[PDB]
Symmetry: C3
Amino acid sequence: IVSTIASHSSLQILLGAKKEGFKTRLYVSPKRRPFYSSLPIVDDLVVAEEMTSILNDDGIVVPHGSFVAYLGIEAIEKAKARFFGNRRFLKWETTFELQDKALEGAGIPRVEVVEPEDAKPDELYFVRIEGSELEERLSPYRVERFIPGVYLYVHFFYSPILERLELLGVDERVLIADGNARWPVKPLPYTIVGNRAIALRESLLPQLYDYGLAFVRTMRELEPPGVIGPFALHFAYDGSFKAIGIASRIDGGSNADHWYSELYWGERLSMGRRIARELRLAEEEDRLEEVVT
Amino acid sequence: IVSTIASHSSLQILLGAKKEGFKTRLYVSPKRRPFYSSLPIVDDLVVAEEMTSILNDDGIVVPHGSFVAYLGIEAIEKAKARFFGNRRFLKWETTFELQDKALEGAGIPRVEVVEPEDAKPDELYFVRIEGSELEERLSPYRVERFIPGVYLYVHFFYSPILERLELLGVDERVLIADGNARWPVKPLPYTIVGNRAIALRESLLPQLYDYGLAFVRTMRELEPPGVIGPFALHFAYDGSFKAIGIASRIDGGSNADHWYSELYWGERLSMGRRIARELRLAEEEDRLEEVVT
Amino acid sequence: IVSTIASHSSLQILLGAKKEGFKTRLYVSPKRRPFYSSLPIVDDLVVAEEMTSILNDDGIVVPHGSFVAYLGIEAIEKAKARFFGNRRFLKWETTFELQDKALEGAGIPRVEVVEPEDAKPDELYFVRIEGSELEERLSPYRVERFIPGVYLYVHFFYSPILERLELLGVDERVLIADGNARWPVKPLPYTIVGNRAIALRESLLPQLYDYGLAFVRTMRELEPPGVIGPFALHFAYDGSFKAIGIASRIDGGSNADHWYSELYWGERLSMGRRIARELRLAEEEDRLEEVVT
Ligand SMILES: Nc1ncnc2c1ncn2[C@@H]1O[C@H](COP(=O)(O)OP(=O)(O)OP(=O)(O)O)[C@@H](O)[C@H]1O
Ligand SMILES: Nc1ncnc2c1ncn2[C@@H]1O[C@H](COP(=O)(O)OP(=O)(O)OP(=O)(O)O)[C@@H](O)[C@H]1O
Ligand SMILES: Nc1ncnc2c1ncn2[C@@H]1O[C@H](COP(=O)(O)OP(=O)(O)OP(=O)(O)O)[C@@H](O)[C@H]1O
């Protein structure tokens, strides 16, 4: 019943499914299977050179941050497989156009875009789609105002079965851009290595919830059913929140150990387990149409 | 029975109370209530422009880091409401005078104070009540020796019902002073955004426990009953501990996911839940006078 | 039955043992016993000036990172006490010779060694057994290429009773070399103060598992039974993994709150509890010879 590609957050996903009593199926490549085959959370392990076998019947596919990189956006939207939570939404985090449209539509403050009209020098900027340059600026992308100050990744789960928006965690990325923390040397790459669970100052959560609620509303318009399971808003905290992006699926920073879900449930429960519980709840109520695609 | 202001650590507090079987009441403002009303952990939700409605009968108020900012110290000490753990103690973290008196009285090493007798330049200093300056020094506060090196926030819970001091966690603040970690730019504000739970090197805990025990002793003198529930000692680890402050109530870094409590209990249990269990234990033993005010 | 020295990770160890139903015995010094005697997880508390009382019969000693510093390597290998997981292995993390031998034997990439043939200046290096210098280089050790970029400590548990390698967590050290993260000042000491649990990007785990499997294989040769319980590989992530060291016993970064174990078990379970469950499994199957020394 529950299957997905081996990478990104399939561990969290499968463990949560096997936890909710569902059966497990993982599509993995020959190089990566040694590790995953040693895991007691996988029942059916489908080894393959390519993951394009998205004809996975029977089960619900449950996407993550590797699906587009392993399969085009086209293939997925026209895929035969069942799929968890909308599916037309997945593309909304893929381009600036869609990302802006939604964030603007929700009223969420975003980092300002900068077209070559700097303040050379000592006026550095961030170049997205990364890397940051100074005055010069000479050398598909966008230029943004450089903002120093903790980057927070808020995880949400809107549930149709319960008709509520759940703020389930706040992540902080572990970038290779460290080793400067100990002793700064030169600009390093912003590639993520891992994620740190962080307990946000409580006085900021209400604001994020409002932004989240607004996001759900406009997405319900902009893309018919609009946001069924997990999603994330990415922010730069200046001391005034500016949105830098979104996650149209389980973010990844959700692999970190967040609590919060304990606010809606008696038990902890991760994002991957939340998705599975959403599935199980739909089953027991003949819903299940409201959460898939 | 259990109520408190919506902010700081009311989430942790209410969840822990509802976990110990207590009833829940939250005082929240109109702007922040959307978020909190969607939480299954609140039973009675008292919306209000101002929180000055501290006539809350029936229940136990349970204070946190917002109470003085929402209500003066005067009002609270003369408040009518029941209140968890002492109450005269809450003011001891409010001024240098009280902070020093207690820390000195407990024999705890504190960061040295510096009156304009620098070592200009490259001799930077920290200015409290923040911000750090260099040589110049020109431009209610105190000047302290600048100390680089992990800032640890130790959480304690002295319980009368059990007559023991519990070391329940060690927090690390997430400041906006980051984004320098990746690439240093300029001195940033030290405002906290969140908290990270950290497993301290075990060889350092005994020392902290000793300082904690001593703190309880002198507070039992300096302020009659002295320290009934949660409190925290703030340190700068040079490789030799220097106290920089204290928390005369639930600190906030306690929102992070700490274990430790598992050393006194079979189960995890947060600080907010610890306060509630203290309450329930008192109830079942007709104590309850020993833990309130 | 289960005893060990009070420091490093004895808290984790004892709690896990008391959790698996085992009895607990802690050897502690007079100065540190106040703290440990207040802990409900210790049954028999053996106070002593020196820990050289390694004649501990009845129980299984379970070593950690303080054993060699409290007792020589000689004494331990010829010790009378029972001891958990091999014991001849414990010395393999003690010297470069052994560390290299093993890492080379497993085909694990290691940080390159540098003999005075720098690139003075701005070409800084790390000096192990710490501290980092620049061009000059003038002033038992080794010199390594300086590498900036998150240091990861992977925790493993090879179990004979189950004949499998378990990747149970990834730690990140909290060094005093911080306070530079907020605002860089001067090169600080790399002494650890604590540990942060980190959820590693899932695409990197398979690679570490492979290195781990290989480590087990060669250790099974290089040191007869080779690696029975916990061990750790230390890396520098450049974006291409370079080994900097190993832990021939429970690492310490295992005191942090890791999940992962939930992949092999339905429950969380720490490393200290993992060692204890290994013991209990052996008991129930008359094995117990396969996991002790
Ligand atoms: N406007 C900005 N100013 C300064 N730094 C920034 C800015 N935007 C992003 N960053 C840096 O990059 C990090 C966030 O990267 P981000 O999560 O946006 O990458 P990404 O969009 O997920 O990459 P991809 O689109 O390929 O998945 C932060 O840690 C931050 O330090
Ligand atoms: N003596 C010092 N030297 C260098 N940095 C310091 C010093 N004291 C504090 N800091 C910095 O500030 C942070 C601690 O701030 P702190 O917790 O003392 O603020 P605060 O007292 O809680 O503010 P408030 O009193 O309004 O609640 C640390 O992260 C540290 O980097
Ligand atoms: N090759 C290197 N280049 C740059 N920094 C390094 C290098 N090796 C180690 N470090 C720094 O030191 C830290 C790792 O220290 P490490 O864990 O190797 O000490 P240690 O070997 O455990 O000390 P001990 O042997 O006494 O137990 C990292 O945080 C990293 O910043």
